[PDB]
Amino acid sequence: ATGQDRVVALVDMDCFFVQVEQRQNPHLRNKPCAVVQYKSWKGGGIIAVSYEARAFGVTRSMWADDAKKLCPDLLLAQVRESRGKANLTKYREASVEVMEIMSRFAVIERASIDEAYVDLTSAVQERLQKLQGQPISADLLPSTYIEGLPQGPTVQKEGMRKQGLFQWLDSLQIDNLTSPDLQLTVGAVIVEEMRAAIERETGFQCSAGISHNKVLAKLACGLNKPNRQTLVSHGSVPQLFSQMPIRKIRSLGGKLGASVIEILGIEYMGELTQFTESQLQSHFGEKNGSWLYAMCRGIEHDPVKPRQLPKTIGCSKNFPGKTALATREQVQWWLLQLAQELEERLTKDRNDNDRVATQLVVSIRVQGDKRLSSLRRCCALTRYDAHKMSHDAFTVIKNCNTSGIQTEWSPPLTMLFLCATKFSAS
DNA sequence: ATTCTCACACT
DNA sequence: AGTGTGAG
Ligand SMILES: O=c1[nH]cnc2c1ncn2[C@@H]1O[C@H](COP(=O)(O)OP(=O)(O)OP(=O)(O)O)[C@@H](O)[C@H]1O
């Protein structure tokens, strides 16, 4: 098994929240700009950055005041706020615009508010038979890069792209409808069409990767951004992985990836090929070890899930520093604000998607604790009523209050979280 | 003191 | 059910 059975793409909207704001406010187009939340603290936290501003060093996680030091002419758009918290509706609605367009071409897996995996295997098979056996012109691939080409015996970027594409298409075996490289190329043709449709019908640009699985497609998508697509063939994997830091591969960006590096004494994905599957299973567990053994050879089997809608709907707010909640009536009021935005989104979900959540997950963070969450408790979600959820959420957390007072909350809360789960068809 | 979602493995 | 990891 060479892991070449499928054609999978990953589409990523370029600096998505910035694009939504630039479409709305033309004064922001083709300018260094960023999208910010919470204007009062250090000018707002940056959550999205246009490519013109990235050339000044502006990134996410930065404070707007700091970003303005790197880029004095940075323009800012601020996220809507509703009931004291950032409100992402505008961006979720734009996300829906794009996913509905993608769904015309293939079945998609929503991966995040601005990326989707695309399973193109069947679409490719139908384009191949409609294609008689005539050649794929480079005109059908006007923004595609072939990873690893050109090679062998031009100083500008578009020149290189074309030379790589010409070498690929020259050597393509169009008479063999079962060559995986041919299937990828047809897949790339379809993704060009899908990206043209997205830009025509929404004004939004995106990048894409086309490969044989989700991990290679995601890696490919990042190789030539913005507004370009990249085909990573099975054959391109040994050279690509030979200098690819382990942490770049999806799921290895964290503690497991650091353990792979430290325990094995390696730096690059390709270096994993020298270990047996049992060796990797002994260090990292049966599942992780088998996964790493196949993945360093370019092979991964995670399916594209036919799922365009999230499985949970959640509402959280952080209260860092001196703003940590300290009174019972503070905690009730913020629980109510979260439960009100949750009710709004749930009722829209019951009208748009014909389902009802049935479990309510309540989570809190305590000043001094270390982790994303300190505690998770659940109860039934029987009615989409903000006052009832918020009452119920308090009920299941009210005993975490270590204070002997009834009107004080010790120790102070640095996060409230409400999440609706366990949907059933309605 | 960036923040906020959402998915899944493990137990 | 509750915790921990990883991602956009
Ligand atoms: O580190 C994060 N903490 C919280 N939330 C994040 C983070 N990272 C990403 N998000 C969310 O996921 C959207 C698009 O995530 P993204 O990585 O695809 O970033 P962009 O499209 O802006 O730029 P690209 O680099 O893709 O061109 C972001 O706006 C935001 O909603």
Ligand SMILES: [Ca+2]
């Ligand atoms: Ca993106």
